[PDB]
Structure formats: C-alpha cells, structure tokens
Design a protein around this nucleic acid. Structure first.
Ligand SMILES: [K+]
Ligand SMILES: [K+]
Ligand SMILES: [K+]
Ligand SMILES: [K+]
Ligand SMILES: [K+]
Ligand SMILES: [K+]
Ligand SMILES: [K+]
Ligand SMILES: [K+]
Ligand SMILES: [K+]
Ligand SMILES: [K+]
Ligand SMILES: [K+]
Ligand SMILES: [K+]
Ligand SMILES: [K+]
Ligand SMILES: [Mg+2]
Ligand SMILES: [Mg+2]
Ligand SMILES: [Mg+2]
Ligand SMILES: [Mg+2]
Ligand SMILES: [Mg+2]
Ligand SMILES: [Mg+2]
Ligand SMILES: [Mg+2]
Ligand SMILES: [Mg+2]
Ligand SMILES: [Mg+2]
Ligand SMILES: [Mg+2]
Ligand SMILES: [Mg+2]
Ligand SMILES: [Mg+2]
Ligand SMILES: [Mg+2]
Ligand SMILES: [Mg+2]
Ligand SMILES: [Mg+2]
Ligand SMILES: [Mg+2]
Ligand SMILES: [Mg+2]
Ligand SMILES: [Mg+2]
Ligand SMILES: [Mg+2]
Ligand SMILES: [Mg+2]
Ligand SMILES: [Mg+2]
Ligand SMILES: [Mg+2]
Ligand SMILES: [Mg+2]
Ligand SMILES: [Mg+2]
Ligand SMILES: [Mg+2]
Ligand SMILES: [Mg+2]
Ligand SMILES: [Mg+2]
Ligand SMILES: [Mg+2]
Ligand SMILES: [Mg+2]
Ligand SMILES: [Mg+2]
Ligand SMILES: [Mg+2]
Ligand SMILES: [Mg+2]
Ligand SMILES: [Mg+2]
Ligand SMILES: [Mg+2]
Ligand SMILES: [Mg+2]
Ligand SMILES: [Mg+2]
Ligand SMILES: [Mg+2]
Ligand SMILES: [Mg+2]
Ligand SMILES: [Mg+2]
Ligand SMILES: [Mg+2]
Ligand SMILES: [Mg+2]
Ligand SMILES: [Mg+2]
Ligand SMILES: [Mg+2]
Ligand SMILES: [Mg+2]
Ligand SMILES: [Mg+2]
Ligand SMILES: [Mg+2]
Ligand SMILES: [Mg+2]
Ligand SMILES: [Mg+2]
Ligand SMILES: [Mg+2]
Ligand SMILES: [Mg+2]
Ligand code: NA
Ligand code: NA
Ligand code: NA
Ligand code: NA
Ligand code: NA
Ligand code: NA
Ligand code: NA
Ligand code: NA
Ligand code: NA
Length: 194
RNA sequence: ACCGGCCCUCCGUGGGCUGCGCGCGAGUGUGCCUGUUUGGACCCGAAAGGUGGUGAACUAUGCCUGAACAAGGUGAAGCCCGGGGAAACCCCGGUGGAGGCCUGUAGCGAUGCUGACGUGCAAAUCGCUCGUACGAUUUGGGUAUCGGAGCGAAAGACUCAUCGAACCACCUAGUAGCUGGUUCACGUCGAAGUUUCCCUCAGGAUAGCUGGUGCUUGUCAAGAAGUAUUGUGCGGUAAAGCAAAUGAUUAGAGGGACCUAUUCUCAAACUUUAAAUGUGCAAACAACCCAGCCUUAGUUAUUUUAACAAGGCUUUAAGAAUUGAGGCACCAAGUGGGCCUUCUUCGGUAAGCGGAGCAGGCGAUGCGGAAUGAACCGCUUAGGGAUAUGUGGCGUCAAAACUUGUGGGCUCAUUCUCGAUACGUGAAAAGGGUGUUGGUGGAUAUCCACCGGCCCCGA
RNA sequence: AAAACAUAGGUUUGUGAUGCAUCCAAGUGGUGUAUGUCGCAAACUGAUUUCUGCCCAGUGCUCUGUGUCAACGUGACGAGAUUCACCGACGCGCGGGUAAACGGCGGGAGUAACUAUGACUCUCUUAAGGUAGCCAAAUGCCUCGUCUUCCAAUUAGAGACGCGCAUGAAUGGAUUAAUGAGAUUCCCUCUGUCCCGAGUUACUAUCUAGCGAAACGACAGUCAAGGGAACGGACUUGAA
RNA sequence: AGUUUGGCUGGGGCGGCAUAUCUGUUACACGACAACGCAGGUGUCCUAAGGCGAGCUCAGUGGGAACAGAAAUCUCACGUGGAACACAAGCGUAAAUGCUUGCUUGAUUAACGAUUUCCAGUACGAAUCGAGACUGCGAAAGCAAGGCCAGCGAUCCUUUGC
RNA sequence: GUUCAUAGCGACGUCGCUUUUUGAUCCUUCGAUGUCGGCUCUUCCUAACCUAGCGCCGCAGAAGACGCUAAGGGUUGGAUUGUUCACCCACUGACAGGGAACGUGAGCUGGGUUUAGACCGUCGUGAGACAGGUUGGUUUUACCCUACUUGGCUGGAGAUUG
RNA sequence: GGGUACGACCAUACUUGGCCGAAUGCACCAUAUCCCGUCCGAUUUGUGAAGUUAAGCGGCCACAGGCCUCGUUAGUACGGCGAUCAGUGAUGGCGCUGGAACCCGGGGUGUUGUACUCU
RNA sequence: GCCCGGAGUCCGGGCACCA
C-alpha cells in the first residue's frame, strides 16, 4: 500500500518534475480531465460554478481521480448525462520520493520516485463545471460531495462570467447580436479593428 | 651608480637578471625574563624487549633398592571315576582354581545434590551419595631430564599458591599524540572551536582571534569609518511567461493523419522581462588647472603626441552628510570536539535527527521577569543611599486597584472535573449543533440560503 | 570425566652401519645402539564381522639424457683500471611413477493404451562425474517435512520414505554381543515433586555472663507532579 | 628470528570513493558556502584533428528528372544556425571559431620580465600580457611560439644535451 | 444486503489517536545500572470476555449482531517445545487485552543465549570461521539509612518559652 | 530637392505585397586575342558600348506582421526591518518603508560625418 | 632488464630488481 496522505501534505521541496534527470516515474492515476458533453457550443451552457482552494498544499493524483468519479456519478444519477460539462484544472506534475529501508540507516538516503501530485495555491481554481440554469441545485450538491475527497479547505462559488468564457454574463448576448464576438471552440474572442 | 656571478644584441656613454651586496660603520662582553631543542626534563602509571644467574621438597616422566592390598560370587585348562559306540569319538558326576572377571573393606579417586560454607575450619574445605579395588595397581628413600627450555596415555596440562613462555637482580625513573594531579593575594586587559598541509580524523605545523614591549606622529585629524547622499558601473534570485525560443502537457474549432489560430495546466539542472536587500569606484594638497621652458636613443612623413622635469598664476544656491586620533613593527600564549535561535535553505514520513547562509547569543555571566528551565523577555554587572523606570504584574499565598472606573459587550462548560502569561506543536483535526449572540442576499404582512464570535460533540 | 586420549588389530614410509633418525658453540664429542630387517626410526586409522569403488588434471613426494642459473678457471682489445668471449654443478624446466600422499567425485530437454512417474533417447561438459551402503541421523536451510505407532491431547520418542541447502567408504562406510558416575523416550513399583499443606526433634537465631571484628563510610536520608544531562534526598508548586 | 598487514564512514565490517581533479544545479541576481546531496566526465587522442590565405554555407523543408521506390544522383527556392567544432557539460561563432582546398612546421628558441587561478597570498598543474632570434601564410594590415578553458608529479639517486 | 446507501457492512479517497511491534537517531551510562523464559506477589489502565442496568435490529420464541453508563468482583486443569509465541484435549458464567526500568536474580531456578574441552556439515592451503546442529560446563555479601510488618518507653496548645 | 565612394550608431533601418521614378550616376548589358580561373567566361578575370529601366536601387502606401516609445496592468505580485501579532496548523494581515512583468491601448517607422558632384 | 628458442617482430620460457 501507499503511505497515508498526511506524509505529503505540505509544499516543502522544490517542484522536481519528470524530465531527463528523473526517469523511472510511475504513471499518474488520473488520465482524463474532462467529463460530460465536451462538444457543446459556448451558447448552450451559460452558468459556471467553481471550487477554489484556500490553502497552499499538495493534492495527490489519486484524490483527483476519486473526485472525478464521484462528481460524474452524482450528476448522471440525479440529472441527464449531457446536461453539463466539467473540467479539472490541476495537473499532477510534481514527483514524490520514498526512501525504502544492503546498507542500513540514513546513509545514502536519497529516495526513488513513487507517485505524483499537484501543487495548488491560495485562490486557485481546482474544478470548473458549466451547465444550464435549471440544474444548479444538482451541480452544487455534486461539487459538495466531490470536495470531500480533497484535503484542506475549499469554497464553492458561482462565477460572474458566461461559462468558461472571459465575457461578463449579462453583456454576452449584446455582443452576440452585434457581431463583435468570434467563436473558436469553447471560448470566444473579442473582435477589434486591427 | 658601484662590487661579485649568469647572460643577450644590430657590439654601445646598449640591454636584463641575481646576492644573507655596498650606498660615512654597530658591534661585543655580562646580568635577567620569556620562547624553541636535547637530556629522567612538571609529578605518578602499561601490555612488552634484552643480559646474567636460582629452582624437579608442589607437580610431569624414566631408573635403583624396599613396603602393601579384609570378606564373598562365578567357576577356564589339566586330572579321576563311570556310561554309550564297530569305529571315529560323544555324555554325566567330581576335582582343580584361571581371569588388565563381578559384589565389597583399607587404599587410590571425585559423579550428583548444581546440598553446607561462601568477610569459611579451609587463598578449594565439610556431609551423604558415587568410580575402582591382583593390576596399564598404590606407596617411602635415592638418582636422572628445564626456560624459547624440560616433561606430557595430549587438557596448552604441569615445572614450589606463579605458565599461550617460571623465579631473582640488572639495562630501567623503559616509551606513552592517552587517564589522574599540579600549593599565596589584589590590579590592568582578555579569546577560539575557523583556513591550508600532514598514514592526517582523541595530535601537530600554518594564518586568524589575544597580551606585552613599543616606534613615528598629531591634537581638530594624514593612508580614518561594518553608516548615509550624489554621480557612475556590475547582476539573473523572488516575481512573471508559455497567446515568445528549449522541455512537458489538456481540449474544442476552421481548412483519421496533417496545417492555421487559439485554449487548460507546469520547470533546481527553461527563459524574452525583471525587483527589494546587495556589490565596485569617485567626492581635493605627495592634488587639479593656466601660461611659458628644458630633456629623450619613445610615436609620427614632420609638426603633433608620450614620458621626466624646472621657474610663475589660480584654487580647501538646490534637503547637499556627521562621527573622530592616523600609520608602522617585534616577541609570545591559549584555541584548532562546539551548541542554540529569528529569517533563507538541502536529505528524510518525521525527530530534542543529519548538513549549510547572513546575523545575534550561550560556552566565559550573573541580576530582574515568564511558578520551575544554558540559549526566551528586560537589562548587561567597583562598595553604598535617595529618586524614576524596563519586562511582568495589582483576590490570598505575595509588594501593588483594603476586589479601581461615576466603561462596553460575549460565555454556563457532569468523574483526567469550561477557560485563563508568547517561545512552549510544553495537546489536537476532518466533520457536526433548532445552544446563544451578530452579519449578508432574497421573498411577506414572518420564511429561505450563506458567513462569523463564544460554547458543546468528535476526545 | 565426555562421544576426548590411549589400546589390541590394520596399513604405509626410510634404512645393510663410511647407514636411517638425530643432540650439539667445539673435539678421535652424544642418543635409538649392551642394537642388526621376527630390528630400529617416522606417519595414519582404531576390537571382532563384512567391505574398502572412480580420479595423477592442481599441490606435494619421487625416478632418468640438454634450455637456463654462481663463483673458480681459459683467452683476447688496451699503457692499465675497466670490458668482452668461452667453460661452468645441484636445482628449475622437459619425460615417467604415486591417493591406507593433501584432496576431489555434473547440468539441461523430450519420452509408456486415464493421469502420474520415466526403464528409453538426445544434448552441453569433467582429471573423474558419488559405486556398495546409510539418513530430517551428534550431519536437512525450507521444517513443528510426509505416513504409521505410542496419548484424551505430543515442535518429543520409535518404525518407514529420500533430487541428500551441504551423507558416503583407513579425511574410513555399514553392523555389532559384552561393557558405561556418557545423551534420549516409554512402562511397572514407589513415594510430600505436586493437589495443599500439618505436627515433632537436635543445633542456631532470640535473652544473659565473659570476649569481641570486618565490609562500607562526600554530606545525608518521607512523597506526588514539573522541568532538568530526556528515571531527584536536596531545586519549583502541593501533600505529610 | 624481526617487522608489517591504508583512510573516510549516521558504530565497525562488506559495499562505495564523496582520497588528485573538470561541467551544470543545490547556492539565497558581487565573490565565497556543506552532506556516502542530484546529473555527468578525467589518466587518453591528433604531422594533422597544429599555422595561415582563399573560396564556400550548415541541419532541414518544398517543387521537379529512365530504371529509382520513404530513402542513390542532378536542379531551383526558402532556410538567425534548429548543424559542426575528437571526448562530459556550459559559453561562443555565418563572406566564421564551421566545410573544402593550397602552402607549411610558431607543437622551435625564447637573456631566472610581470601577472591570474588554489592560496599561507607557499609549491605543483593550467592560463594571461610582454621583450629578443629565426621563420610560416598572406598583395597587405595582420595572425601564429599547439589543438581556449580537465588530460598530471618534490628531496636523494640514475641517465641525456650544451 | 428478495426491494432498501447507512439493521449489519462499506470500495475509490481523506482526517486522526496510541506507544502493548519493528524501524530511524545516538542525548545519559564502558574506574560495570547483573542481559531470555518460568515460579511467587501486589497494584494500576480500559479499547468490556463473564457478572449489574439499558437502547437498537433483516429482535415472533431460543440463540445472537451493534451501541451506552460502568474496571466493584472474576478470568482455569493438561500433552509437545528453553521458549514469549503456537497448536490440540477438557471444564466453565468466562476462560478479555495491557502497564509498572520490555515489574520482580543481595527472591528462586539456570533449560536457552555467550568463554575455556570435544564431535559433525559447509568454508579456508593453514592457524581457524559459521546470527548452523550437538553434548558438558562455580549464580557471592545486609549487622547501615529509608520503606513495610509487628513490639515497647515518653513529653507536648506561645506544639517544649509568656 | 538628389547621386556616388568611404563610414559611425547597428530593425524608428527588418520581412511581404503594390505603385512611381527629371537629370548626373549606379546598374542590367556585348564579347573571350591577351592576364587569369573553371566540368561549364554561371561565378571569377581581361577588353567594348550595341540596347533597357524589366530587375537590382531610391521614394510612397498597406485597420500588414515585427521593432521603438508612452500609458495601463498596479501601489497589484514580490521585498528589507518590527511585534509576549492573529491562527491547532497551513499561512496571513498590520506598522515604518522600496516597488515589478506579460496581455492590452495611443503614437512612430532611421539619424548623421568626410570628399567629388547634379538640379 | 639478461640469455635464449620459436614467429623488423610477437609469444613461450629460466634468471635480475635503491628514483
Ligand atoms: K625541560
Ligand atoms: K622454583
Ligand atoms: K577366584
Ligand atoms: K560398582
Ligand atoms: K591546528
Ligand atoms: K570419563
Ligand atoms: K568418568
Ligand atoms: K568414560
Ligand atoms: K597402531
Ligand atoms: K571395519
Ligand atoms: K549479653
Ligand atoms: K555480656
Ligand atoms: K554476652
Ligand atoms: Mg497506519
Ligand atoms: Mg615505569
Ligand atoms: Mg621489538
Ligand atoms: Mg621428588
Ligand atoms: Mg568391581
Ligand atoms: Mg553448591
Ligand atoms: Mg572405597
Ligand atoms: Mg584448545
Ligand atoms: Mg617521570
Ligand atoms: Mg585533569
Ligand atoms: Mg574588559
Ligand atoms: Mg605522506
Ligand atoms: Mg519562480
Ligand atoms: Mg596552532
Ligand atoms: Mg570548554
Ligand atoms: Mg544573559
Ligand atoms: Mg498585598
Ligand atoms: Mg568435576
Ligand atoms: Mg577394524
Ligand atoms: Mg570401528
Ligand atoms: Mg592428482
Ligand atoms: Mg578441505
Ligand atoms: Mg569412464
Ligand atoms: Mg537426509
Ligand atoms: Mg536431530
Ligand atoms: Mg513426555
Ligand atoms: Mg527416524
Ligand atoms: Mg560432501
Ligand atoms: Mg578410498
Ligand atoms: Mg566426512
Ligand atoms: Mg565394567
Ligand atoms: Mg561414563
Ligand atoms: Mg518523587
Ligand atoms: Mg541520590
Ligand atoms: Mg547573494
Ligand atoms: Mg554568486
Ligand atoms: Mg575566412
Ligand atoms: Mg589543456
Ligand atoms: Mg616574437
Ligand atoms: Mg591558444
Ligand atoms: Mg557508575
Ligand atoms: Mg553494581
Ligand atoms: Mg541495582
Ligand atoms: Mg514498553
Ligand atoms: Mg525486566
Ligand atoms: Mg543473583
Ligand atoms: Mg530472571
Ligand atoms: Mg532485585
Ligand atoms: Mg548445552
Ligand atoms: Mg525582539
Ligand atoms: Na526537503
Ligand atoms: Na577386576
Ligand atoms: Na578526553
Ligand atoms: Na579415539
Ligand atoms: Na601429481
Ligand atoms: Na546413492
Ligand atoms: Na521425531
Ligand atoms: Na577506520
Ligand atoms: Na468505555
């Protein structure tokens, strides 16, 4: 088994990523960072809900995978499968080491790569979900259950922007009528004279 | 420039090196203290090494000549008398007294109680029990073999309570980077556990920190400053970026790979950009200008430059520093195990763990506070009065509100018992509460959602 | 005090005296030897019974005809020191012998009418590839191996099995009547070993008369918690 | 008979080399900084892979040509270095420090000149700026006394040159 | 779990407690703090096995599962093994888990571990080695202070005085 | 208002496309006896004027890219010094003080020295 | 390093060692 997560909670070391110097790294537990209807035009989902961290700490890849499974399961059961789209915005790039105990003691104690984790900051957004205005109570409950899989303190807020887009929610449909917006996939670009 | 020595060239009134050289002498004898070295070497201490002698009365083994060993059991060879048989030969009964034979005294030993005693009767003894007891048996006197040697039915056993190398005297006060000790008073000063080298890591040499003796001077300040200001240089950490190069990486879109523009998320060994704190130089007299002048084998096609000089001239508002003794030696001690802390930081799950950076401490140091504590807070110390504070306090212990205010709120806590001085984690989490007390946003003439304070469950 | 040593029995080696072993500073010096192979000196194994397999590649010991190895000799150049050339033994190399000298003595595949196993085959390789025997043995890690017997119950004992980490033949193998203050298991008898302790005796201790030490001894001697060199008699607070 | 039988070290031993040395990072934007901290190298190689002059442009991509294809050779265009520079890494470089070619021996001697790095401001190794001789390549200015920075060694003794 | 997330469980995750395991460290003790197990004896803790009283169930009864107050009382006899541990037989209401210098050697015992003798296997040329097996192997002193158990003498309120 | 030769700073000067270009000049351009060099007078070398601004070159323009400058981001991120400061912690604000970066928005698209020269 | 032997020369032997 792996050690309890209390042994890797605080950001005590330099980032230490996977590179040509650190090679024998196991694969992270989470591989997909999107659930729900990814192929949805930006106009379909106008409501966005965030969960944002309030601590400076590390979150393991197992916890991210546990949160993804729980959030998807509740939305599918309590609502339609296609009525939402969720994105995980924390990728595990920090490698953790372990010193497994022919020599004995603390001699030559540099460890071997064992797992991966994500380093988060205060005010950073961890998960983002966009949905319709009639499924907000379901989205809030699903995110509530998901955040119970993380260490530390997190808060749940509703954004003032149109879903996954940097344009204010009330002012989006004016700039859509008067064609000042160029649609590129899931985001939009403000057209300017240039 | 001159003396000695080694040289170079275009060979001259060149050139460049070297001496513990010279450059109007400073040595020498003696007294005294301190340091280095050898000697017993400040005092006491090994395990060892060598030279010459004394021991076989303990004990080991051989030899000469003497002494000793109750009482029983078993019953070998030889011999006698009877039977059986054709022979070969076989059988009974006696007698006899063999044996590194058996039971068992004396003798010679020492298995168990892991008995007694264990400052004893005794530096190995005592009580029961036990091995053997005609044999490779026990024992007196005499004699023979020893110290790197003797002897051994062999255990490194024994050689006078001494043996994996006896005893006595001497070399010998053997050497010890290691342990222990080292005897009067007051006064002036006062550290280091770091650098480089060492068969170096419990030790030295070397520089640094310190003391003594000074020298040359100055007196408001020279060759002053762990500090500013002004001017002028240096930089790639924190941050930021990936819509910029290198590396890693998620997803849609427009024309299954592919292309274009975007997009989520990153970097100690990535970077266009780029701080704060830092770091170099300058801010006047052995100096700078101005003018004229001399010299050269330097530069230049010549002047003009370069360098060394000599006689005259000038010079000590704008936030616009402020503090004050400068420089130079000689001789020598201790130290060369360090530890703690704010902040920065590497290894480790972590540690009262291991290892670094700038600074301050303890060590070497008390005093006043945190009840108690090397390092925390205050303050740092000649012997004493008066006055006032610092940290911390004013219910009693215990000096101070003889329980201060004519100031607001909040809290009720049943068996490790609510809470109450930081450092000190030197006691606590996720998650909950229609306990009570405050806010924010919505609805209606009180209802919903969310966020705090103290208390309660988790414990 | 033994399973160790010795022992009888067994095997091997040297040696015909101007010898083999060997003392010793030395000599017409000394010991086995007052002896003479049925003797003396040097090793190993350990009664009897039945046996003692294969290996001379390594190391050692030992026996026979030309590369190398020292001084001494014999010639040269040179004025001479110096130098050069040739000759030069045992030994070491070559060639034999020797294991009751020291010692050593294998892997991997396939294969028989249900499965299993493998008499059979192939392959790599050695100086030789462990034979007769014996075993979870005082030698077996795994291991308290697996089966039977002994008990109500056995990591124990005995009897079997054997790809044996790492058994094995005078580094002796296997077996043995008699013997043992040798190690282990079970049975009968017996009991204060125990269930579970009780009563009695003699000498002490205990009191007295006489006599009369030693060890040890910073100072001393009630606790709880705290902090402290992280387990206080002393310090802080409390309680006696 | 005499003497010896390394050291460091989260005890010692086995292991390893942190024992003499080079590059990046830890390292906190001057310099300096530890660990048996991380990622890697060194005891060699080269008469050319040294010196200079000249000419040229690399990696790669796209459009074209019998056999010929994803990949052979020829041609045009783009191409800030994404190639190469003996080897580890960093820095550096485009009519060049790269590639080809021509000629050469500055990889010699160099009067004890001065200096940097480690540092006691000692030595050793490496490197920087000069003076003199004789030369090499260039029309000349000029460049060169090795291959830039790692690749090595006291007293005594032996041996060679003048 | 006939359905039913939560009677009883609960994956993927995440937050803690304890010092009855073993590691990590090297602060105290090397002019010595007697090192396994058993026997004997006392006391403490609760994370409750039995005994008292209750709630709840997928509690009809009987037998049970889960939880609460509660540590007053109780918690065995044997075969094998040095064992702690382990595993069987049997009784019982029940045969709970732990601490006290891994309680307890001037209280015992000495089977094991760990000297000197000796045998075996493997290793080593050898002397010898093995956290492999085997057999044999001295357990010393209390009369001191305190603590505890019993046993006696005797003052004293300004706790000796005013 | 210009050309040529030699330059300094080295993108406000570069990259792409389009348009225009009076004269002097600069070019493209003709050819291989000789000097010289190539597989090839392509480049290079030696000798002429037959044609032409086609290209090179100069000037202007582009909701052009890039580059330069000023604002904004923002007193934000980060920092030096202090507390018997808050918080179980992770961390954070406060006092005295220093102070960024990209995106984004406005503007701009070479300056100039010596000599010989054309209008 | 010396003497050889076998292939201008690489191996196999018997000897010898003060930086
Ligand atoms: K002395
Ligand atoms: K004697
Ligand atoms: K008899
Ligand atoms: K007897
Ligand atoms: K020193
Ligand atoms: K015996
Ligand atoms: K005996
Ligand atoms: K015996
Ligand atoms: K014999
Ligand atoms: K036999
Ligand atoms: K008496
Ligand atoms: K008396
Ligand atoms: K008496
Ligand atoms: Mg655990
Ligand atoms: Mg002495
Ligand atoms: Mg000696
Ligand atoms: Mg005698
Ligand atoms: Mg007898
Ligand atoms: Mg006894
Ligand atoms: Mg007798
Ligand atoms: Mg012995
Ligand atoms: Mg002395
Ligand atoms: Mg002392
Ligand atoms: Mg003083
Ligand atoms: Mg040395
Ligand atoms: Mg950063
Ligand atoms: Mg010193
Ligand atoms: Mg000290
Ligand atoms: Mg103080
Ligand atoms: Mg008072
Ligand atoms: Mg005895
Ligand atoms: Mg026999
Ligand atoms: Mg026998
Ligand atoms: Mg042989
Ligand atoms: Mg052997
Ligand atoms: Mg054969
Ligand atoms: Mg066996
Ligand atoms: Mg056995
Ligand atoms: Mg039994
Ligand atoms: Mg058996
Ligand atoms: Mg064998
Ligand atoms: Mg044999
Ligand atoms: Mg054997
Ligand atoms: Mg007998
Ligand atoms: Mg016996
Ligand atoms: Mg106490
Ligand atoms: Mg005491
Ligand atoms: Mg710095
Ligand atoms: Mg630096
Ligand atoms: Mg060139
Ligand atoms: Mg070099
Ligand atoms: Mg020169
Ligand atoms: Mg060079
Ligand atoms: Mg002591
Ligand atoms: Mg003691
Ligand atoms: Mg004691
Ligand atoms: Mg314990
Ligand atoms: Mg104990
Ligand atoms: Mg005892
Ligand atoms: Mg005991
Ligand atoms: Mg005791
Ligand atoms: Mg034993
Ligand atoms: Mg302070
Ligand atoms: Na770390
Ligand atoms: Na007898
Ligand atoms: Na000491
Ligand atoms: Na024997
Ligand atoms: Na042989
Ligand atoms: Na066999
Ligand atoms: Na058995
Ligand atoms: Na050592
Ligand atoms: Na309880």
């Amino acid at each position: 088994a792996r050690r309890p997560a209390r042994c890797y909670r605080f950001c005590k070391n330099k980032p230490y990523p996977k590179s040509r110097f650190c090679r024998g790294v196991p694969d992270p537990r989470i591989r997909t960072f999107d659930i729900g209807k990814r192929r949805a035009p930006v106009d379909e989902f106008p409501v966005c809900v965030h969960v944002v961290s309030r601590e400076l700490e590390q979150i393991s890849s197992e916890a991210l995978e546990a949160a993804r499974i729980q959030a998807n399961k509740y939305m599918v059961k309590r609502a339609n499968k296609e009525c939402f789209h969720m994105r995980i915005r924390a990728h595990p790039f920090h490698v953790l080491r372990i010193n497994k105990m022919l020599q004995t003691g603390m001699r030559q104690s540099y460890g071997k790569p064992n797992g991966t984790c994500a380093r988060v900051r205060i005010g950073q957004i961890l998960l983002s979900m966009r949905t319709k205005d009639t499924y907000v109570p379901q989205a809030l409950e699903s995110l509530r259950r998901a955040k119970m899989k993380f260490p530390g303190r997190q808060i749940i807020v509703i954004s003032k922007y149109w879903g996954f887009t940097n344009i204010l929610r009330n002012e989006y449909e004016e700039l859509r009528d008067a064609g000042k917006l160029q649609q590129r996939g899931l985001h939009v670009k403000l057209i300017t004279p240039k």
